[PDB]
Design a protein around this ligand. Structure first.
Ligand SMILES: Cn1ncc(C(=O)N2CCC2)c1C(=O)Nc1ccn(C2CCCC2)n1
Ligand SMILES: [Mg+2]
Ligand SMILES: [Zn+2]
Length: 313
């Protein structure tokens, strides 16, 4: 109970900032995550013996793919941590518990391929889950790991608290399906503009938690330009591998995924920032004002992508 995790001074200060990079040392990421749980949730939220065993089972069940990997897990969890710390009083005890765990687990056992590719390949998971295929798989993997002897980090909650936290996590992980993001944000925009947005409405909270999850998931675009730029190599490395596999099924992939159309990458980033990222962080800044630094960072990085095309880097 009297055992705090502590970070070296630079990490200690910088972890509080939205644009913090977790670093290249894998062996520190677990303790970074636990540090964030103790300051977000308290030293009491989770039996340390169990939390540590949960974290390492989850680490073990992410694969060594270029992007959708254990480093993405912890990066996405840190963004949620920054959002929760800057919006202390809007969130319940349960929500702080569920959401950092949802973020850590949201891409469990990802193979590095879109729901679209599973369906064109006719992968079994596409027969078992007809929409949000990988995302229902991720929640299924999370429940599996929670049920290993000595892994139930939630065992100390009441029956109902337990059921609420699993329903928070399930919605959170399903919301990371970007096909659902577009309508979710449209509705939040309408609801905030017409003034009907009410955070005691559970269905409204669910939508807000969904936008928070999309925001944390895309947070590579809110980092210092060298982080953003070097992460997009990892993102395109999976896209191109998926394009390759499409061609193997005798299908021309979309140019986004065709490694012969690298030239078109900066313009693709423009579409993504304008059509996805900027609107995401805009609506989130409108609903949660202290998240403005994610919107400012994202705009700076769109501007760095425009610079790339004009030949200025
Ligand atoms: C940079 N970043 N971060 C996350 C993702 C992403 O979508 N992944 C991670 C799970 C799916 C991307 C990303 O580059 N997406 C892109 C790039 C090009 N497009 C097209 C759609 C709109 C216009 C062109 N979309
Ligand atoms: Mg995912
Ligand atoms: Zn993700």
């Amino acid at each position: 109970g009297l055992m705090q995790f502590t970070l070296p001074v630079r990490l200690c200060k910088e972890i509080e900032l939205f644009h913090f990079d977790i670093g290249p040392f894998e062996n520190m990421w677990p303790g970074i995550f636990v540090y964030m749980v103790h300051r977000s949730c308290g030293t009491s939220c989770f039996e340390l013996e169990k939390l540590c065993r949960f974290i390492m089972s989850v680490k073990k069940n992410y694969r060594r793919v270029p992007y959708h990997n254990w480093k993405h897990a912890v990066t996405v969890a840190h963004c949620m941590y920054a959002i929760l710390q800057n919006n202390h009083t809007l969130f319940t005890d349960l929500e702080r518990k569920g959401l950092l765990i949802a973020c850590l687990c949201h891409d469990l056992d990802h193979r590095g391929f879109s729901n679209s590719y599973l369906q064109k390949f006719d992968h079994p998971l596409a027969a078992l889950y007809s929409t949000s295929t990988m995302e229902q798989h991720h929640f299924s993997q999370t429940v599996s790991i929670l049920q290993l002897e000595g892994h139930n980090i939630f065992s100390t909650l009441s029956s109902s608290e337990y059921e609420q936290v699993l329903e928070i996590i399930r919605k959170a992980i399903i919301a990371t399906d970007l096909a659902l993001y577009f309508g979710n944000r449209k509705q939040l925009e309408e609801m905030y503009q017409t003034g009907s947005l009410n955070l005691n409405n559970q269905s409204h909270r669910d939508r807000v938690i969904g936008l928070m999850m999309t925001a944390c998931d895309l947070c590579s675009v809110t980092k210092l330009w060298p982080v953003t730029k070097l992460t997009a190599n990892d993102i395109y490395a999976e896209f191109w591998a998926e394009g390759d596999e499409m061609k193997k099924l005798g299908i021309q992939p979309i140019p986004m995924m065709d490694r012969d159309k690298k030239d078109e990458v900066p313009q693709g980033q423009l579409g993504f920032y304008n059509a996805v990222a900027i609107p995401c962080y805009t609506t989130l800044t409108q609903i949660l004002p202290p998240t403005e630094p994610l919107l400012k960072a994202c705009r700076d990085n769109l501007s760095q992508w425009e610079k790339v095309i004009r030949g200025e880097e």
